[PDB]
Design a protein around this ligand. Structure first.
Ligand SMILES: Nc1nc2c(ncn2[C@@H]2O[C@H](COP(=O)(O)OP(=O)(O)O)[C@@H](O)[C@H]2O)c(=O)[nH]1
Ligand SMILES: Nc1cccc(NS(=O)(=O)c2ccc(F)cc2)n1
Ligand SMILES: [Mg+2]
Length: 170
């Protein structure tokens, strides 16, 4: 079979995880998607000449059993850590997602990309510089996205695939 990359999109409720995933897979912006629904989505794509399968888990936070959360973190190969540029709390939450994923995977080398979503909104409480400072500290890429206009969306997911490839070649 072609290579499949298991990606997981994490972050506070309301940041745009669903809107980002649906833009990537279906190429439309979704206004309202129930905040409590967690699903995975597949799309065949071509990234730097490689035909491959993205299998994206759009998370929604607490699970019926914590074992479920630990199971998708161990299965996931790379994680998009999303905050919204107008929600400082969602940015502060990134610390806990970075920690938790490394802790479950018991790894210091987990492919991740920091994503600051809703870049189309003039309303902003998290400046680019602050998010760059966090990404520099983690040694991972940082991309600002808009699920609404699609700006940065392919970049965020494809950069994550590229981080996964760097990890695999070691
Ligand atoms: N303006 C704008 N609104 C967005 C963006 N992404 C998501 N939203 C809206 O923010 C709200 C939460 O988005 P959703 O995808 O459900 O967030 P989730 O809880 O992380 O899955 C919804 O009303 C979306 O329409 C974006 O990039 N720009
Ligand atoms: N695309 C991905 C990424 C990580 C996990 C999965 N699927 S999975 O390991 O069966 C899974 C495990 C626990 C869940 F709550 C949801 C999905 N898919
Ligand atoms: Mg959602």
């Amino acid at each position: 079979g072609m290579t499949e990359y298991k990606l997981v999109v994490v972050g506070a409720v309301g940041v745009g995880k669903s809107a980002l995933t649906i833009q990537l897979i279906q190429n439309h912006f979704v206004d309202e998607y129930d905040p409590t629904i967690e699903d995975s989505y597949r799309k065949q794509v071509v990234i730097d000449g490689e035909t491959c399968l993205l299998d994206i888990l759009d998370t929604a936070g607490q699970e019926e059993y914590s074992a479920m959360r630990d199971q998708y973190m161990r299965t996931g190969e790379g994680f998009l850590c999303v905050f919204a540029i107008n929600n400082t709390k969602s940015f502060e939450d990134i610390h806990h997602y970075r920690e938790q994923i490394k802790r479950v995977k018991d790894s210091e080398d987990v492919p991740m990309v920091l994503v600051g979503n809703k870049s189309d909104l003039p309303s902003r409480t998290v400046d680019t510089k602050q998010a760059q400072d966090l990404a520099r500290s983690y040694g991972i890429p940082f991309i600002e996205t808009s699920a609404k206009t699609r700006q940065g969306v392919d970049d965020a997911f494809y950069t994550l695939v590229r981080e996964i490839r760097k990890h695999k070649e070691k």
